[PDB]
RNA sequence: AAAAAA
RNA sequence: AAAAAA
RNA sequence: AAAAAA
């Protein structure tokens, strides 16, 4: 009797939940100092100037981790007013220390912007900071600039248009985490096909069209470093957070992060999917029960995180392995196995892992082959229908 | 009837928890001295160079046990700012003596450190402890270094390079616990496949891959003293209770526990997870019961340490022969032989002990060969699908 | 960790 | 009092 | 004590 519920007790220590409160003492490692250009005035031109300098910059081969994930969050909180204030809020990490910088505008230099917080005779940090290489020498190729050529710069006075701008360019960049961290090279027509789609939502204009290499070098720079996901992410949970209305930014990004939530638990909602909706007689076989528990138990301590639970694997934290597979290779592999053929979407996508049986593949298949019409005993006796019309054309 | 309860009294006196209260008096034998060159300044130059120096050392055939295993400490405890404040909580142990000692940089000797607790005017006990011999004489392979021959100095200067380097480094010296007590010679492919994992986690990079030799010494040391272990130990252990964010390295190090809880506790888990979890009608069996209630009291005493229990056998403790199967070896090779036919990746696990009885592990595996196919009773009837559709294929 | 998801 | 028990 | 476990 009290065996099982020992048993259960046991089961849900291993995976207990690490929340908040005190213990543990207080850790930190060293800290970078990025600079982010944040835009002091909440004029338009100005940020409209900003974010074609930045852009101009951000696709240049040579560029520095730092500058260049600096340069990524400026770019990304730059839609609210007064962004210092949001980075502030939001900024909550001890991986790199944000040094905020104002910005204004200016009509005595090239890149036509100085910094507000260092000094208004600092002009020439400016123009060092934003445009100094841009393949002049090595690798011409290097540099990255919109698909159309005509569009020599993004620099707008209307403020639709650099509102539509910000928007399409803050989708662009979002987008990149459905498969950043998962398979990143392999996530070209996943966004090419998220672009052609906004843009007939009438919310973007393709004009604003990027080249690839700057969207894969900004992959790549975002899941180099964490720090980046995770402020991205902490703008998501407070954006999915905001109680009244949403502007048009916030829900265009509160639309995309459906496509970032779950970006590497497939291998767990594809399997609770297969394997516990479809509610199939494997299931209750003897060789399943341990991973049906280990499953209701990952569940549950998802359920019990909050918020932030979907974006385990962007964070890249450590409790995503307890999620992986390799506790239930067998209902996994199962799962997998049945949605190859009920699905029918999941043929290229790879799960050949060191812990697969294709036993259990070839098992869920033929068990799917032969139940294409084979019509449960619940919803038959719920409905109470017989099998004769299931059978008719299978 | 008080007969089962008179029992059930004296079985769980037999494996009375340990708890601390204060009786016992205490006793302590002798403690070594054992140097850490803890960096005093929180640069990160003079961090890359200890570290270099320190690698550089550590590779060398012709050391010293207590040196070395100083050396390695050293190296674990140097993300954290000011090491010394956190190797002051973590050690309480009395099996040596942490002497701390803080260090600087130099630009007048060959090393280029000195110790500052000592004095400014000794330098030449840095070089004489950082570089005295390194394969001149007697064995020239005897010293280690890193596969990459071009890398003659691992000396970084940029925070994030020093920052993957110190975090590299430490995953490979934390990967190693996962065997290092339990079969070390035979943990070779294990860490190179953990390193081949890690680095396409964008965590780390290969090109800080050591030489065989470096990791063997390094885990026979580990397993020769047990001080290292317990402030390993210890060390997992206040990272896991930090309430808060925890930094890369810190999550590194959460995540490598992983492999390291249970290292030796096979023999526990797996018999848990196959003669417990599954349910099977030989459970039943009269002669189980006692192996039953054994491993009840087991995982209870387990559940009842704290922390510090899965660790139990890289402690090496005294308790760790509790959780062997000596007092359940029936149960034990029937839950092996069933994992040997379920698992189907335990074989190359070695079990062949002086108490192995291959009568109950033919037994298991015939009813695991028999019971392919057979759906119980308590899923069965909480579903209430029939075995028909599960012995289609068996 | 790997597909799809106005 | 009589074996085994990382 | 002995395997696997993004």
Same mark, same amino acid.
């Given at each position: 009797?009290?065996?099982?519920?020992?048993?259960?007790?046991?089961?849900?220590?291993?995976?207990? @939940?690490?929340?908040?409160?005190?213990?543990?003492?207080?850790?930190?490692?060293?800290?970078?100092?990025?600079?982010?250009?944040?835009?002091?005035?909440?004029? /338009?031109?100005?940020?409209?100037?900003?974010?074609?300098?930045?852009?101009?910059?951000?696709?240049?081969?040579? /560029?520095?981790?730092?500058?260049?994930?600096?340069?990524?969050?400026?770019?990304?909180?730059?839609?609210?007013?007064?962004?210092?204030?949001?980075?502030?809020? /939001?900024?909550?990490?001890?991986?790199?220390?944000?040094?905020?910088?104002?910005?204004?505008?200016?009509?005595?230099?090239?890149?036509?912007? @100085?910094?507000?917080?260092?000094?208004?005779?600092?002009?020439?940090?400016?123009?060092?900071?934003? +445009?100094?290489?841009?393949?002049?020498?090595?690798?011409?190729?290097?540099?990255?600039?919109?698909?159309?050529?005509?569009?020599?710069?993004?620099?707008?006075?209307?403020?639709?248009?650099?509102?539509?701008?910000?928007?399409?360019?803050?989708?662009?960049?979002?987008?990149?985490?459905?498969?950043?961290?998962?398979?990143?090279?392999?996530?070209?027509?996943?966004?090419?096909?998220?672009?052609?789609?906004?843009?007939?939502?009438?919310?973007?204009?393709?004009?604003?069209?990027?080249?690839?290499?700057?969207?894969?070098?900004?992959?790549?720079?975002?899941?180099?470093?964490?720090?980046?996901?995770?402020?991205?992410?902490?703008?998501?949970?407070?954006?999915?957070?905001?109680?009244?209305?949403?502007?048009?930014?916030?829900?265009?990004?509160?639309?995309?992060?459906?496509?970032?939530?779950?970006?590497?638990?497939?291998?767990?909602?594809?399997?609770?999917?297969?394997?516990?909706?479809?509610?199939?007689?494997?299931?209750?076989?003897?060789?399943?029960?341990?991973?049906?528990?280990?499953?209701?138990?990952?569940?549950?301590?998802?359920?019990?995180?909050?918020?932030?639970?979907?974006?385990?694997?962007?964070?890249?934290?450590?409790?995503?392995?307890?999620? +992986?597979?390799?506790?239930?290779?067998?209902?996994? +592999?199962?799962?997998?196995?049945?949605?190859?053929?009920?699905?029918?979407?999941?043929?290229?996508?790879?799960?050949?892992?060191?812990?697969?049986?294709?036993?259990?593949?070839?098992?869920?298949?033929?068990?799917?082959?032969?139940?294409?019409?084979?019509?449960?005993?619940?919803?038959?006796?719920?409905?109470? /229908?017989?099998?004769?019309?299931?059978?008719?054309?299978?």
């Amino acid at each position: 009797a009290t065996l099982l519920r020992s048993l259960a007790l046991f089961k849900r220590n291993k995976d207990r @939940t690490p929340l908040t409160a005190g213990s543990g003492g207080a850790i930190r490692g060293i800290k970078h100092v990025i600079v982010v250009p944040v835009p002091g005035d909440s004029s /338009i031109v100005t940020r409209s100037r900003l974010l074609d300098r930045l852009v101009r910059l951000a696709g240049d081969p040579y /560029i520095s981790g730092p500058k260049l994930t600096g340069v990524m969050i400026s770019i990304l909180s730059l839609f609210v007013e007064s962004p210092s204030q949001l980075i502030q809020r /939001i900024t909550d990490d001890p991986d790199v220390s944000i040094r905020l910088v104002e910005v204004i505008q200016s009509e005595k230099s090239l890149s036509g912007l @100085t910094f507000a917080s260092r000094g208004a005779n600092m002009e020439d940090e400016a123009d060092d900071y934003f +445009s100094i290489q841009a393949g002049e020498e090595g690798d011409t190729r290097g540099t990255h600039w919109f698909e159309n050529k005509e569009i020599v710069e993004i620099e707008v006075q209307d403020p639709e248009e650099f509102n539509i701008l910000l928007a399409s360019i803050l989708a662009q960049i979002w987008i990149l985490l459905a498969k950043a961290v998962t398979a990143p090279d392999t996530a070209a027509d996943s966004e090419t096909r998220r672009w052609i789609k906004y843009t007939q939502q009438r919310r973007v204009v393709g004009e604003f069209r990027l080249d690839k290499g700057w969207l894969d070098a900004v992959r790549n720079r975002i899941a180099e470093d964490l720090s980046l996901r995770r402020f991205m992410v902490a703008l998501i949970l407070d954006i999915k957070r905001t109680p009244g209305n949403k502007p048009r930014i916030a829900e265009m990004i509160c639309d995309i992060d459906t496509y970032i939530v779950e970006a590497g638990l497939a291998s767990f909602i594809l399997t609770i999917k297969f394997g516990i909706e479809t509610m199939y007689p494997a299931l209750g076989l003897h060789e399943f029960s341990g991973e049906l528990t280990t499953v209701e138990s990952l569940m549950n301590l998802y359920q019990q995180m909050g918020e932030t639970a979907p974006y385990m694997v962007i964070l890249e934290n450590s409790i995503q392995n307890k999620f +992986s597979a390799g506790s239930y290779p067998l209902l996994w +592999s199962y799962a997998m196995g049945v949605g190859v053929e009920l699905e029918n979407s999941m043929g290229g996508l790879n799960f050949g892992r060191s812990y697969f049986d294709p036993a259990y593949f070839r098992l869920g298949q033929e068990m799917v082959r032969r139940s294409a019409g084979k019509v449960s005993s619940s919803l038959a006796a719920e409905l109470g /229908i017989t099998a004769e019309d299931a059978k008719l054309v299978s």
